[PDB]
Amino acid sequence: HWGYGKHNGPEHWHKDFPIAKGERQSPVDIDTHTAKYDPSLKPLSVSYDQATSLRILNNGHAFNVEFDDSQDKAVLKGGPLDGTYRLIQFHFHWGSLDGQGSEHTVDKKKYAAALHLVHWNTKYGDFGKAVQQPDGLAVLGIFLKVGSAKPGLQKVVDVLDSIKTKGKSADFTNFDPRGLLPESLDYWTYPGSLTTPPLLECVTWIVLKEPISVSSEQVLKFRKLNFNGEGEPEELMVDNWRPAQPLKNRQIKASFK
Ligand SMILES: [Cl-]
Ligand SMILES: [Zn+2]
């Protein structure tokens, strides 16, 4: 199966998922001088006040916090989007060292980690149908840099012990994703794909310009997770990120100048 190792890592994915070499793959490097400021871009509308988190699980490649998406509780609108997009889950990508971990890079700069909040277009009925459409998903990407602790991230950091190995899950209710948002909602946007197989090209990427800070102790906890399942030899879950892909015939737009 695919993974992030020498023998099953990103460079091998194309063999099982040919779309890996597609036209609108992610992530990409964001060249800030080439990004086009687009004054017609509306501001983002993040309505997470009624969000309902359910559980957190280690799926073998990252840990996901899942939300109840049976109704319009936590939605994303505005920006470059048409319609309402429902939050289904968020996960992170991180490195073994503080100088790597994010999937997107800004002017070649890599951040310690990246938080991806995944949303699906409600006009398609369910997540499964949405991934098969060019405008089915909207992923809000937030960079993490090591500095001071993010208070709102601790509840997530403290439960990691319970889901150390692949397949483990824990109840994770009453978690408010609003505590993970930076102060500014300025962003870059471009059409792309999922960064893990099946790598479907159904995503509208919205990358926030402003990163949030987390302490080294907080990121250290992420690094204690395992790719393997219980009773198998230990493989630390680190460097679960895909390298930047060529932009090809796409333009990255900026909501700010
Ligand atoms: Cl990223
Ligand atoms: Zn991701």
Curated annotation (Swiss-Prot):
Result, substituting residue 64 to L: Reduced activity
Result when mutating residue 194 to A: Reduced CO(2) hydrase activity
Reaction equations catalysed: hydrogencarbonate + H(+) = CO2 + H2O; urea = cyanamide + H2O
UniProt-reported outcome of changing residue 59 to D: Strongly reduced activity
Gene Ontology CC terms, in alphabetical order: apical part of cell; cytoplasm; cytosol; extracellular exosome; myelin sheath; plasma membrane
GO molecular-function terms, A-Z: arylesterase activity; carbonate dehydratase activity; cyanamide hydratase activity; zinc ion binding
Enzyme Commission number, as recorded: 4.2.1.1, 4.2.1.69
Protein name: Carbonic anhydrase 2
Gene: CA2
